[PDB]
Amino acid sequence: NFPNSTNLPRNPSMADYEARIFTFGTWIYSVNKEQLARAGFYALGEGDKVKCFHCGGGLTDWKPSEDPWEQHAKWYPGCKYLLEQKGQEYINNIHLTHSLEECLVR
Ligand SMILES: C[C@H]([NH3+])C(=O)Nc1cccc(N)n1
Numbered sequence: 001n002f003p004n005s006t007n008l009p010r011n012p013s014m015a016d017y018e019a020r021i022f023t024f025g026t027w028i029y030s031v032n033k034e035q036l037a038r039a040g041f042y043a044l045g046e047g048d049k050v051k052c053f054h055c056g057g058g059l060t061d062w063k064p065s066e067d068p069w070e071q072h073a074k075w076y077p078g079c080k081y082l083l084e085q086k087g088q089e090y091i092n093n094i095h096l097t098h099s100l101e102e103c104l105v106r
């Protein structure tokens, strides 16, 4: 499934922060649910799997140190919600950062 790069959300029923929050229920996982919901994510109810309401990009297997906005930018860099909320520049920073990580341990 291709990532949505238009300015229109793939899932408008999940456009509201409050709607996204409800999807998690009791959350046992390593990354905080309010932080996930703030970065556009809602829970699928499949382990720690979340999906962005806008781009539809899915993410599983979250580690405790990992930041929702950073992962959002890393895997779904065409997301227009990400662009609106964080700005190109934050986005490029993240990309430069992860590319330089994926070079200094090699
Ligand atoms: C959040 C985790 N570190 C991660 O990168 N997860 C990921 C990446 C790409 C696809 C899917 N499903 N999950």
Ligand SMILES: [Zn+2]
Pocket: 040, 052, 053, 054, 055, 056, 057, 072, 076, 079, 080, 081, 082
């Ligand atoms: Zn997105």
